[PDB]
A paper describes a structure:
Additionally, enzymatic assays were performed to shed light on the catalytic parameters of PARylation. This reveals that PARP1 recognition of and activation by DSBs is modulated by histone variant composition and post-translational modification status.
To obtain well-diffracting crystals of γH2A.X-NCP, we designed a cohesive-end DNA fragment (147s) consisting of a 143 bp core with 4-nucleotide 3′ overhangs at each terminus. By ‘locking in’ the entry/exit points of the nucleosome core, this (type of) construct may generally facilitate structural characterization of nucleosomal systems having diminished stability (elevated dynamics).
Numbering used by the authors:
A (entry chain B): 23 to 102
B (entry chain D), F (entry chain H): 26 to 122
C (entry chain A): 38 to 135
D (entry chain C): 12 to 118
E (entry chain G): 13 to 118
G (entry chain E): 38 to 134
H (entry chain F): 16 to 102
The structure:
DNA sequence: CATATATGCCGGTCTCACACGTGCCTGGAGACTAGTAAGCGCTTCTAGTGGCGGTTAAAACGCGGTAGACAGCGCGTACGTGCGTTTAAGCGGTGCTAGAGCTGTCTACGACCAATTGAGCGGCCTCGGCACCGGGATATATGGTAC
DNA sequence: CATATATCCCGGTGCCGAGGCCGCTCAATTGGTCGTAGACAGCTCTAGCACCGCTTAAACGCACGTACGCGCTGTCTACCGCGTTTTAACCGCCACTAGAAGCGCTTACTAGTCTCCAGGCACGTGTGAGACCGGCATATATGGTAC
């Protein structure tokens, strides 16, 4: 029912295939859901910390870019 | 003669040591490690504060930039306690002017 | 009827998705997840549309990388099938996990 | 007149003046507020006390008066939050935590 | 009267802007006259190198306009750019086609 | 509608694209990537140059600090080229005083 | 006379070296290797002894770390013996390549 | 006006035992015979990479003596921060 | 072999983002002044280098044998396919207004200054903590043997 | 059960590094000055959000059955433990001087200021690159069956 289930068994397949995975155990999908959640948690936490510091109520691309930089996941193409 | 004046946090590390463990000493190498530690966390906090100021077109690092830096850099309970200890020292300093 | 042997479509899909650059998660489910996770840190938040897109680019890129390293850990164990324990070892060696 | 040290006024052992100088002489911003070095010196003092507490406990478990680098390593690696803070740091002469994988134990 | 230090150094990349960004970025008290020319030249060099390879990737793909994928192809096929950009995600970049041998059919 | 002014390197990325590949162009997204790239390498070299100056108790980032930065930052061949393009452009720029 | 079964002394050795902090590579060999490698980068270099102890502390801590990751790669393969392919996989996932 | 003895094969001074001891502290119980040469390879690449950066800091300082601090800044550059040797 | 279907391609068709010309406006670039960072002389003397021989702990080698690596088998089911069905994502939409974020006024605050003074440093001396040692207490792993 | 061999934990011994006294002295404190960063409030209008209802495409679930994970087994040899022999680390001392580190002179370099002048911007266009795509052509997977 939760939003994390919005990340479907098929969407996770597609991502595994782009990373060259041929065969996928059924336990993977929940495992990916948990990893993805920790990833978004860590990144959004820092992004929002930057939003609060600018005294804003809108998360900007630049808040996400600075947050990705901090976490060693530098993203080109959004105002780096 | 009379070697150059090399600064160090050792004096302060000994003071905090005696508060917490009055009968406990520390070896040269252990003090080397505590020195590195304080220099390292200084740079990390200073660094994030610098970035925060620059991202918001501010010329000034204030206790507000330190406090956001501390929250981005320290894990959970360590950040809560650091923030509370830092906010305390500012409040106490602000009223001792 | 007609049936491709098991593994043959899987390979097509690999070739297909490694050839393209489109996002592989549906935008709105992802977006609702972002807003949800963020509520738990600061309430009454708006997001730039580009901020959701940056987050989705970064997550898909991260998961595709991780799947590569997982695939290697599976294969290291003489398998073709990625298991949770492959993801776990990848994450442990990357320094994400303790 | 006075001269009592900003450390006194903030109620800190860590040197506020030095911290303010290092911020200014460190090229971090044009300007440094009066509260910044107070707040910073207080965080560095908190983290020092926190690790010196655990490390002194390690020294005492180890029947020693003096903190050695091994005691700082035991302290840091056995604390979840410190271990993460110093995740990509090497303590000279620290060694590692005693850890044998289960499958290598004899049956 | 009055010409760019970019043209005095034979650079397309802006030596004046780079000098300002150096002074404004709290890197140091002061900035040498050579520094921004050298830096602007290094940024121009690395921009030419990427655009050269990415340009090629655009032809090999029968396209007249460089898109992000061309840049990803160009960076991940070059050993040294791949290393310089080892911890960078190029949005809308995708990955290199690469299946592990043991996965291919018998 | 009162404009609102935001700089990028896009003009300079076109000038260089036209040198290396005169008959090809670039999508705005691809220009975003090239813009991210330039800002990134800028920060990396400046940062390193900044640390080089501090470690050597020096107030000034000269082309020498930029050069050593480029030697630490860029892999072998990219570094030799960059060092060439860098030294050349400084030579050519002083000679046109 | 008396004979420990294969793996009993290995276990003992793991307990011994995990308790101690002493450098495990002999000092002179390690220095000769540092001198050799650096000389190939540049002739007529001297070293502060503490620059050699720093390099040896950093190298041994890197190798202990790698050996833990290498071990995990063996165990993942239902083996108890570390092999070159365990180091290679560890080094690839670490992004050392 | 004298000589330096010429340095040759010094990687072999990272002997089998020393590597085994490092693997012991890393919790390794059993070791393939091929591990010792592989380890030498990996160590050499590590020393090369760190000494390269150290010496570059030294040359930058116009010094002929590599210092602890040059080593420490190099380790910091490589994500291998070291406490106990200054900075 | 033949048959099925996935994927690639062509040539045409359209559309909207690119890349072009046009202001305009600010953010720079030619003087110009004035003070300091640093380059470059000279001296001091630290600590890095190289050399020797007594001792012995570590390394090396070969041996023997066990336990782990590896391959081959065979069983069971977790998957991958493909299908028919359901669900909601995307989309183009028409509002609707939070709030990003710009401008314009005014303190509060932080830099700068440059005499004044005690915090912190380099020496210097010195015991008490601890490294190292050997004796006697266990603790375990392996081997001898009685049932 | 019995016995052999590692490791613990004990004082006892002796060394030397931590830690505390001093006196010197810079960097930090005072307290007065002045320029502006940024706080605050008004205003604008960009772009974030939201209710709607089609129209597909994508998710779902189901049922079939195959290729793969997995546990067993058996073979063999590589790697551990250990005894003996070899080697070169370590130690403690020389002796020698390169170069690190520090000081004082001295001046090009750079920042700080005005003025000007054009480079880089937001705008507005209109048009060709490329996205789509229908249907056609090619490439490849899969099985039939008769050698
Ligand atoms: Mn709201
Ligand atoms: Mn050589
Ligand atoms: Mn045919
Ligand atoms: Mn066509
Ligand atoms: Mn000077
Ligand atoms: Mn022999
Ligand atoms: Mn076999
Ligand atoms: Mn079974
Ligand atoms: Mn409003
Ligand atoms: Mn002292
Ligand atoms: Mn005493
Ligand atoms: Mn003993
Ligand atoms: Mn005792
Ligand atoms: Mn303002
Ligand atoms: Mn000399
Ligand atoms: Mn079609
Ligand atoms: Mn067939």
């Amino acid at each position: 029912r939760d939003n994390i289930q919005g990340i479907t068994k098929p969407a996770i397949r597609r991502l595994a295939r782009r990373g060259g995975v041929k065969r996928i155990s059924g336990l993977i999908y929940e495992e990916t859901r948990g990893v993805l959640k920790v990833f978004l948690e860590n990144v959004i936490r820092d992004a929002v910390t930057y939003t609060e510091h600018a005294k804003r109520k809108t998360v900007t691309a630049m808040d996400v870019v600075y947050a990705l930089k901090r976490q060693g996941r530098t993203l080109y193409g959004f105002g780096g | 003669r009379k070697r150059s004046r090399k600064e160090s946090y050792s004096i302060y590390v000994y003071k905090v040591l005696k508060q917490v463990h009055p009968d406990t000493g520390i070896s040269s190498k252990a003090m080397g490690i505590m020195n590195s530690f304080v220099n390292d966390i200084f740079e990390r906090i200073a660094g994030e504060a610098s970035r925060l100021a620059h991202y918001n077109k501010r010329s000034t690092i204030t206790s507000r930039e330190i406090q956001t830096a501390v929250r981005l850099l320290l894990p959970g309970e360590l950040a809560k306690h650091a923030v509370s200890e830092g906010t305390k020292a500012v409040t106490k300093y602000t009223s001792a002017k | 009827p007609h049936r491709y042997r098991p593994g043959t479509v899987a390979l097509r899909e690999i070739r297909r998705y490694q050839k393209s650059t489109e996002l592989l998660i549906r935008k709105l489910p992802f977006q609702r997840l972002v807003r949800e996770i963020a509520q738990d840190f600061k309430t009454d938040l708006r997001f730039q549309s580009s901020a959701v897109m940056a987050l989705q680019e970064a997550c898909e890129a991260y998961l595709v990388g991780l799947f590569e390293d997982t695939n290697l850990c599976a294969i290291h164990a003489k398998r073709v099938t990625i298991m949770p324990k492959d993801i776990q070892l990848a994450r442990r060696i990357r320094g994400e996990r303790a | 007149r006075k001269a009592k040290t900003r450390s006194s006024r903030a109620g800190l052992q860590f040197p506020v003046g030095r911290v303010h100088r290092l911020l200014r002489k460190g090229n971090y911003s044009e300007r440094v507020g009066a509260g910044a070095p107070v707040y910073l010196a207080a965080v560095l003092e908190y983290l020092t006390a926190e690790i010196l507490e655990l490390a002194g406990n390690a020294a005492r478990d180890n029947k020693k008066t003096r903190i050695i680098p091994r005691h700082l390593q035991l302290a840091i690696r056995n604390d979840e939050e410190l271990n993460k803070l110093l995740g990509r740091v090497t303590i000279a002469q620290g060694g590692v935590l005693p850890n044998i994988q289960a499958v290598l134990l004899p049956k």
